[PDB]
Amino acid sequence: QDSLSFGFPTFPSDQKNLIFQGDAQIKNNAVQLTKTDSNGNPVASTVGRILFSAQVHLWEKSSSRVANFQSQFSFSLKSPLSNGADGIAFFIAPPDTTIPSGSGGGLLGLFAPGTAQNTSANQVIAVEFDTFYAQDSNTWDPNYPHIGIDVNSIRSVKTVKWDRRDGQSLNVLVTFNPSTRNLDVVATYSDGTRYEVSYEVDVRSVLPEWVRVGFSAASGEQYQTHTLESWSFTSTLLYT
Amino acid sequence: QDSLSFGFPTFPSDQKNLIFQGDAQIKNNAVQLTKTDSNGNPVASTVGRILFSAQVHLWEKSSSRVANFQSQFSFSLKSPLSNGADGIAFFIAPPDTTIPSGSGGGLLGLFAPGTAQNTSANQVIAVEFDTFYAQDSNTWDPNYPHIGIDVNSIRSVKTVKWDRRDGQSLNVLVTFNPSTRNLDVVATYSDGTRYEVSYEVDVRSVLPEWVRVGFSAASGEQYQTHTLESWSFTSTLLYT
Ligand SMILES: CO[C@H]1O[C@H](CO)[C@@H](O)[C@H](O[C@H]2O[C@H](CO)[C@@H](O)[C@H](O)[C@@H]2O)[C@@H]1O
Ligand SMILES: [Ca+2]
Ligand SMILES: [Ca+2]
Ligand SMILES: [Mn+2]
Numbered sequence A, B: 001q002d003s004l005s006f007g008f009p010t011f012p013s014d015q016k017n018l019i020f021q022g023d024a025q026i027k028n029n030a031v032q033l034t035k036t037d038s039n040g041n042p043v044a045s046t047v048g049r050i051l052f053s054a055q056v057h058l059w060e061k062s063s064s065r066v067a068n069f070q071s072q073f074s075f076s077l078k079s080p081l082s083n084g085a086d087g088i089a090f091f092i093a094p095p096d097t098t099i100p101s102g103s104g105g106g107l108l109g110l111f112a113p114g115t116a117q118n119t120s121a122n123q124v125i126a127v128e129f130d131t132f133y134a135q136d137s138n139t140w141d142p143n144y145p146h147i148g149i150d151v152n153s154i155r156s157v158k159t160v161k162w163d164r165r166d167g168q169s170l171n172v173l174v175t176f177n178p179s180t181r182n183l184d185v186v187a188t189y190s191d192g193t194r195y196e197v198s199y200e201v202d203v204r205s206v207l208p209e210w211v212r213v214g215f216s217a218a219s220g221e222q223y224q225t226h227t228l229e230s231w232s233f234t235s236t237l238l239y240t
């Protein structure tokens, strides 16, 4: 299809079109990307991702068209302590993507250790909400919580300082305009606090014509829940 | 997802989200439901269907909601014979639906001979454009080409006279309003000729909560091409 759209105002238990990977599962009408114990408490060493089953036609080489897309979602992070880790990310990747071996902790379940910073070895565009930046393990991170745009590397091509708020839902809008090639990210808390980050990227040189979209999250030794509360997505192939 | 929509202005050869069954295949940017030879001419004894891969949430027991959906599509039929057969149908059925054994010809690839008229043994809602009505074989049909609404039986709950026009595209809009439970069908040719038929049906008593949507066509001894040219679909769960 030239156009595709879907909306999950909430996430009931009887899902049919979601691909669950790792520890991801539905709990209380929401998607819990990372594992939680009996009493809904976050645990260490866990990775989880979800992908929508239908493939998205991002660009078409024959017609020279590229899709414009918009992804709107909300999530909350909760942790018994304050150094919650590691973060959640919205990502776009080849249809057969799977959790890379040893991609836990700071790699957010998106990259493999040996190639995490090699752009020519990966095929992924992601918007990360990174809450852990200890320089001993996350050497590629700026020294503060941040939202970042990742293009084939865990080392973001662009970041903006962000504030982690335990238990508060963050509303996010990610938009890609094929006319300008700008990938824009706007995130807001209910009180109006806003964060913005954008980057120019030619999706045609990074990803295949057909892709899958979804979310990924992980917790290494430090932990927190990564709760995806709602998600809507729309894409339309356009002539630039 | 509570809402899902997709649009195929045309059908390029490179498809990822369509389930092909029987002889269905893409040719010249359109879906040829029934088999055609090298010259593109129709052949006898063929059945084919396509289904969109993502499942549609038609209704939800736990929330008392039923989907409002619309399906717009265009198709054309072509045959050198004076009595092209057998017809094309837009249908909604359980996700695991497959072509029933011996469902060729007048059964349109939707029903098995043994239970074709047993409403208690089927789970399918379809809108048929039936061009073959030989009273000796298709005993259940009115004696003329027609558009029919089929609910668990090849014997339509209601039909209206229709004119088959060789090589001309018919544009169809099928809508379902959960508030009135009306399934409406409006079909038009490019010269403004219009056909309309409506039926009240509670989809909750006929189909499961999750379903797949698609098209089916067949040709028995008599034949014609059944070419699906375009298709757009949208569905959203609403409170009733
Ligand atoms: C206390 O944990 C910090 O220090 C440890 C000792 O150097 C590190 O092993 C540890 O790294 C792991 O956890 C973090 C946080 O979950 C994660 O980002 C990293 O990829 C490792 O899994 C952390 O730096
Ligand atoms: Ca980090
Ligand atoms: Ca017939
Ligand atoms: Mn980071």
Ligand SMILES: [Mn+2]
Residues within 6 Å of the ligand: B128, B130, B140, B141, B142, B148, B154, B156
């Ligand atoms: Mn009929």
